[PDB]
């Protein structure tokens, strides 16, 4: 009730903060930056800088399947179903199918009037893998959705509940995490799901409190690969005391000397376009001296980018609750 | 550097007959027309599955039973717990129909019968275009994929004639922001129903790329028999027309709300409603038959000394 509305205000405030400043964070005072951002590393050129696609794969990737050549396998299977004839009942025959392990409740779904549609799949479409689906937010819905909350997927004759992972749609190797799905561009939802060969329409629904489903996102399936790297960015901010000739003393960025000594060998930037790196930590309260390529103004703020490959969450639920009929809000 | 006059710069020295064209055009025309004729004959005829028509009203004021009474040749009415779908036969026009219907708003019914249908008949209000429920259904149908669709208006006869023409203009204006070049029809009398049925029979078919590659089936009749009643599982017998491709037992069968399943037998009984008024040939074993393994089966310091003096 009121806690739900308080969480709605909290999520809207988080959306506004992410929209204003992209993914800045406040550094923890008590928790050391070495142990908080332990798995975060800094990239030099983001896209160009080499990230190994096999470093630190989790246990969930030990349960899924991989294509060594997805394009050629899909083309071969489509060529085979197009040209090569498989023996069986062909198009137009009124057939009956005895299928072995079926729960009783499906019959009670038919008897009260719900339609029942079966489809014979392609090979290798029952196994679980990682699906990347390009989506756009429906203009009819405006409530925020966070990056790892559960949604309902209508993907290619299949309906399932799962937790996606939102990333930017680029043609590079590293794709930045989108912490919130905004209503202007095309994003990619990455999730553990059974293999589906493209093309396939993709619908993202959110279950309301009264049993209604609101249409969140509309799009199509893009690929089936766990080789895609989704990267979460953490931006740290620092304020200079005073400016010398291409030398600045940054405060409010770290709060220990060992934290500055930890995040030393990766470069930093500024909001106004300057670029520099940490020269040496000055105080043992986190204060540091760092050199730049040009003398920056006192109102300039320095930024630091930390990157970590984030994997999606195994929340694959094949059961979707039956809706109530949709109506006015 | 540009050299001056003192450096030497030598000036350079500026040193098919019309019968054959018509025959080629006619050859291409015959090939295209033969391919078109084969594709048009492949649907809804004597050799094909029935033309499936999903009748979706887009307003709360649309009297769906009246429209489905107008739409029903020979009518064979399959009934369910609440809804009814009917097979229609026109041996005059030589065409077979299966009319199903669904109110907008209940998401799974409309989407599951829209992913299998061949034509969608959108019913329209004479005054307004559609409800917000109809707009939600239209957004879902556009996102999922539209097959061949036809728009029909139900209530143009109740109005006075001046208002009839003016409201037809206003309705086309309202609808044109979503269906920009589509002709509305009218559903008032039996002859308008006949013209609508003829329009549905002869119409170019939008092809959905997903269901064309995999086999699929809409259940006409389903029965059950339990292997163990306490286990609440057993052999399900589903009967309907094959639509997309040729199905085989060596690949699985997915039911849209209940996941993957393994067929054990496929038989071909008699067609219950043929247009012009037991046998099984398949082998089961797992030499190439896929299994439901979605997951991989493989698993000197003093007491007073501080760190500086240390």
């Amino acid at each position: 009730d009121e806690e739900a509305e308080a969480k709605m205000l909290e999520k809207y405030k988080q959306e506004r903060l992410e929209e204003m400043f992209p993914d800045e964070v406040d550094t923890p005072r008590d928790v050391a930056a070495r142990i908080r951002f332990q798995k975060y590393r800094g990239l030099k050129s983001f896209r160009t800088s080499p990230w190994d696609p096999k470093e630190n794969l989790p246990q969930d990737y030990a349960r899924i399947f991989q294509f060594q050549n997805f394009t050629n396998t899909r083309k071969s299977i489509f060529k085979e179903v197009e040209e090569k004839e498989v023996e069986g009942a062909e198009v137009g025959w009124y057939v009956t199918l005895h299928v072995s392990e079926v729960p009783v409740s499906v019959v009670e779904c038919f008897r009260q009037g719900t339609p029942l549609i079966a489809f014979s799949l392609l090979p290798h479409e029952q196994k679980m893998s990682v699906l990347n689906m390009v989506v756009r937010r429906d203009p009819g819905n405006t409530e925020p959705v966070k990056a790892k909350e559960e949604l309902i997927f209508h993907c290619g004759f299949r309906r399932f509940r799962a937790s996606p992972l939102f990333s930017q749609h680029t043609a590079a190797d590293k794709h930045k995490l989108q912490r919130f799905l905004t209503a202007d561009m095309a994003l990619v939802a990455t999730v553990y799901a059974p293999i589906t060969f493209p093309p396939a329409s993709v619908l993202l629904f959110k279950q309301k409190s009264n049993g209604m489903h609101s249409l969140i996102a509309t799009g199509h399936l893009m690929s089936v690969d766990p080789d895609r790297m989704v990267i979460k960015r953490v931006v740290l901010s620092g304020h200079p005391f005073k400016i010398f000739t291409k030398m600045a003393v940054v405060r409010y960025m770290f709060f220990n000397r060992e934290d500055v000594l930890w995040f030393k060998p990766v470069e930093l930037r500024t909001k106004w376009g300057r670029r520099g790196h940490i020269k040496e930590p000055l105080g043992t309260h986190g204060h540091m001296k760092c050199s730049f390529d040009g003398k920056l103004k006192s109102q300039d703020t320095v930024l630091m980018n930390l990157y970590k490959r984030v994997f999606p969450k195994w929340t694959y639920d094949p059961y979707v609750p039956e809706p109530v009929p949709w109506l006015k809000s | 550097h540009r050299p001056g006059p003192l450096k030497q710069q030598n000036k350079a020295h500026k040193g098919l007959s019309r019968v054959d064209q018509r025959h080629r055009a006619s050859q291409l025309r015959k090939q295209k027309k033969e391919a078109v004729l084969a594709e048009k004959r492949q649907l809804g005829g004597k050799d094909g599955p029935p033309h499936q028509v999903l009748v979706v009203p887009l307003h709360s004021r649309i009297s769906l039973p009246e429209a489905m009474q107008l739409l029903q040749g020979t009518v064979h009415l399959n009934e369910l717990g609440n809804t009814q779908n009917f097979m229609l036969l026109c041996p005059r026009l030589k065409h077979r129909w299966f009319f199903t219907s669904a109110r907008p708003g209940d998401l799974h019914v409309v989407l599951d019968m829209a992913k299998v249908a061949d034509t969608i008949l959108f019913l329209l209000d004479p005054l307004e275009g559609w409800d917000s429920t109809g707009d939600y259904c239209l957004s879902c149908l556009f996102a999922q994929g539209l097959p061949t669709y036809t728009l029909a208006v139900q209530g143009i006869s109740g109005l006075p004639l001046k208002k009839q023409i003016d409201t037809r203009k206003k309705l086309s204006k309202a609808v044109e922001k979503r269906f920009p070049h589509d002709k509305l029809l009218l559903l008032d009398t039996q002859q308008e129903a006949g013209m609508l049925l003829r329009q549905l029979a002869n119409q170019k078919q939008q092809h959905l790329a997903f269901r064309d590659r995999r086999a699929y089936l809409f259940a006409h009749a389903v029965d059950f028999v339990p292997s163990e009643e306490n286990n609440l599982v057993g052999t399900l017998k589903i009967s309907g027309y094959v639509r997309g491709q040729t199905l085989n037992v060596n690949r699985l069968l997915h039911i849209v709300g209940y996941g993957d399943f393994q067929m054990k037998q496929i038989d071909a009984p008699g067609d219950p409603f043929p247009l012009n008024p037991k046998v099984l040939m398949k082998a089961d074993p797992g030499r190439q038959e896929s299994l439901q393994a979605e997951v991989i089966p493989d698993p000197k310091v003093p007491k007073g000394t501080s760190s500086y003096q240390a």
Binding site: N56, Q66, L261, W262 | -
Partner: peptide, 23 residues
Amino acid sequence: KWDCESICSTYSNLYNHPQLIKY
């Protein structure tokens, strides 16, 4: 004595293979 770049040298890339479907 570790920093951000040295600890990345201690990351093995041969443990959690997904099963590969060949061609």
